C-alpha cells in the first residue's frame, strides 16, 4: 500500500521541507497530483525497515552514501534520466548515485570541506600546505596560530592524506574495486607524514578535536580551520571576519575532501515511479524548484549547473563546489565502514607516536582489504 495517484516524500527535518512542499504544490496545480512532504525522526533508519515490507515513501532524500545499503537490498528503483537531462548536472555528481553500475538516485546538492580563514589575521590564505609551518611561526610571534582543525576523525584529515595519491577504494568505469585500497601507498604516506611532522614541530596538537578547533577559530585564536558549511552559522554568530576558500595543495596536488551528495531515490515498491521522475526532473531539478527549497533552508552547492552558477556568486558556495570537484566522492559500499575505523586508528596512532606513519598505514591497509 504505497497510495498510487500521489507522491509521498521523506526528507530530513534540517532541510528545506517547507520549500520542497511549495514545489509539490506547483506540481499539483499543473497535474492535479498531490505531493505530501514528511520529515519523520530517524527516517534513514525507518526507510529500510518499511521499504523492506513494500511500504514507505515514493521518494526519499538523503546523503548518497546511505543509498548503497538501500540499493544493496533492492529498495531503490533504477532511475531513467536521458542523456540530455544527465547533461544538466555536473558529471561527477552522477558517480555518487550509481550502484552495481545502475543509477539509483538523482543528485541534488553537494557538500565538502573547505579552508576557512580569518581575513583580519590572514587576508591572504596559503595556497600550499608546505607554507603553513613558516606561517605558523610568524603568527606565533603575535600570539596566534596558523591552523587548527579536527585531527581525531579521518573525515577531516583525509584531504591532506589523499592529496598526493591516497584513496579509499579505486573507482574506474562506474564501479569500486573493493580489493584496490590506497591507504598505504606512497601518496598516503607522504600526506600523513606531513601531518605528523606538523604535530611534532608543534604547529598542531595531536589532541585537537572538533570542539577545540571550532572554539579556537571562532574566538580569533587561530587564523584558519578546515570545516564544512554546517559550521558557517556558528562563525556568523562569532562575528569573526571570515572567508571560505580552496583547500591548500600538497606537493602541488589539490587536497581531496570526501564529497557528500544529497540525493533523491525512488522506492522500488512505488507504483508512482513515472510521477516521481516527472516531479524530480522537471519540477525540483530546475532553477525555480531548487530556489524554492534553498529559500526555505540553504542547500549549499547544487548539482544543477544553471542554478549552481547563480549560487556561486557567494564565494563560500563557490569554494565548496571547487573543493568538491577536486575531492573524492564518498564510497557508497559497505567496506567503507572498515576504511573509517582502520584509518581513524592509523592517524591517531601516527599522531601520538604510538606507531610510525609507515606501520600505522601498513596496518590500516591490511585491515581494509582483509
Please report, as ranges, the residues that interact with ligand [Xe] according to CB under 6 A: 15, 20, 61, 108, 293
Q: State the cell numbers at 311.
A: 549560487
Looking from the CA of 331 toward its CB, the CA atoms found within 13 Å total 20
Considering beta carbons, is residue 135 or 284 the nearer one to ligand [Xe]? 284
In angstroms, the CA 188 to CA 217 distance is 27
Considering beta carbons, is residue 96 or 108 the nearer one to ligand [Xe]? 108
Considering beta carbons, is residue 61 or 283 the nearer one to ligand [Xe]? 61
Considering beta carbons, is residue 126 or 229 the nearer one to ligand [Xe]? 229
In angstroms, the CA 346 to CA 349 distance is 5
The beta strands (E) that lie in the chain are given as: 7-10, 35-38, 59-63, 98-99, 102-103, 106-111, 114-118, 145-147, 167-171, 176-182, 222-227, 242-245, 249-250, 253-254, 258-266, 301-302, 328-329
Closest residue to ligand [Xe], judged by C-beta, is 293
In angstroms, the CA 256 to CA 324 distance is 8
Considering beta carbons, is residue 57 or 126 the nearer one to ligand [Xe]? 57
| Run of H or E including 277 | helix 273-279
Considering beta carbons, is residue 257 or 289 the nearer one to ligand [Xe]? 289
User: Least distance in Å: CB of 286 to ligand [Xe]?
Assistant: 12
Nearest CA among 85, 37, 82, 83 for reference residue 61: 37
Considering beta carbons, is residue 293 or 364 the nearer one to ligand [Xe]? 293
Sheet holding 242-245, edge to edge: 145-147, 222-227, 114-118, 242-245
Nearest CA among 33, 36, 60 for reference residue 46: 60
Other Cβ atoms less than 10 A from the Cβ of 369: the count is: 17
Q: State the cell numbers at 188.
A: 598516503
User: Least distance in Å: CB of 265 to ligand [Xe]?
Assistant: 12
User: Least distance in Å: CB of 23 to ligand [Xe]?
Assistant: 8
Considering beta carbons, is residue 20 or 115 the nearer one to ligand [Xe]? 20
At CB < 8 A and 24+ separation, what contacts does 135-140 make? 135/223, 136/203, 139/223
User: Least distance in Å: CB of 15 to ligand [Xe]?
Assistant: 6
3-state secondary structure at position 141:
coil
Nearest CA among 314, 158, 160 for reference residue 169: 158
Total residue length of the chain: 370
Considering beta carbons, is residue 293 or 360 the nearer one to ligand [Xe]? 293
User: Least distance in Å: CB of 39 to ligand [Xe]?
Assistant: 11
Interstrand relation of 222-227 and 35-38 (parallel, antiparallel or unpaired): unpaired
Amino acid at each position: 500500500k504505497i497510495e498510487e495517484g500521489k507522491l509521498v516524500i521523506w526528507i530530513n527535518g534540517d532541510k528545506g521541507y517547507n520549500g520542497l512542499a511549495e514545489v509539490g504544490k506547483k506540481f499539483e496545480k499543473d497535474t492535479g497530483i498531490k505531493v505530501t512532504v514528511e520529515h519523520p525522526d530517524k527516517l534513514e533508519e525507518k526507510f529500510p525497515q518499511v521499504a523492506a515490507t513494500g511500504d514507505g515513501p515514493d521518494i526519499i532524500f538523503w546523503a548518497h552514501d546511505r543509498f548503497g545499503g538501500y540499493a544493496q537490498s533492492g529498495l531503490l528503483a533504477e532511475i531513467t534520466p536521458d542523456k540530455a537531462f544527465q547533461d544538466k548536472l555536473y558529471p561527477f555528481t552522477w558517480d555518487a548515485v550509481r550502484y552495481n553500475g545502475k543509477l539509483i538516485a538523482y543528485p541534488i546538492a553537494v557538500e565538502a570541506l573547505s579552508l576557512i580563514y580569518n581575513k583580519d589575521l590572514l587576508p591572504n590564505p596559503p595556497k600550499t600546505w608546505e607554507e603553513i609551518p613558516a606561517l605558523d611561526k610568524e603568527l606565533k610571534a603575535k600570539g596566534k596560530s596558523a591552523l587548527m582543525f579536527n585531527l581525531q576523525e579521518p573525515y577531516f584529515t583525509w584531504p591532506l592524506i589523499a592529496a598526493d595519491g591516497g584513496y579509499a577504494f579505486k573507482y574506474e568505469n562506474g564501479k569500486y574495486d573493493i580489493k584496490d585500497v590506497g591507504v598505504d601507498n606512497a601518496g598516503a604516506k607522504a600526506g600523513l607524514t606531513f601531518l605528523v611532522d606538523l604535530i611534532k614541530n608543534k604547529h598542531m596538537n595531536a589532541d585537537t578535536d572538533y570542539s577545540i578547533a571550532e572554539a579556537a577559530f571562532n574566538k580569533g585564536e587561530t587564523a584558519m580551520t578546515i570545516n564544512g558549511p554546517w559550521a558557517w552559522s556558528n562563525i556568523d554568530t562569532s562575528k569573526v571576519n571570515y572567508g571560505v576558500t580552496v583547500l591548500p595543495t600538497f606537493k602541488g596536488q589539490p587536497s581531496k575532501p570526501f564529497v557528500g551528495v544529497l540525493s533523491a531515490g525512488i522506492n522500488a515498491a512505488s507504483p508512482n515511479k513515472e510521477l516521481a521522475k516527472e516531479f524530480l526532473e522537471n519540477y525540483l531539478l530546475t532553477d525555480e524548484g531548487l530556489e524554492a527549497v534553498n529559500k526555505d533552508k540553504p542547500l549549499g552547492a547544487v548539482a544543477l549547473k544553471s542554478y549552481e552558477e547563480e549560487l556561486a556568486k557567494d564565494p563560500r558556495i563557490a569554494a565548496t563546489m571547487e573543493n568538491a570537484q577536486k575531492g573524492e566522492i564518498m564510497p557508497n559500499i559497505p567496506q567503507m565502514s572498515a576504511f573509517w575505523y582502520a584509518v581513524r586508528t592509523a592517524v591517531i596512532n601516527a599522531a601520538s607516536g604510538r606507531q610510525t606513519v609507515d606501520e600505522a598505514l601498513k596496518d590500516a591497509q591490511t585491515r581494509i582489504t582483509k
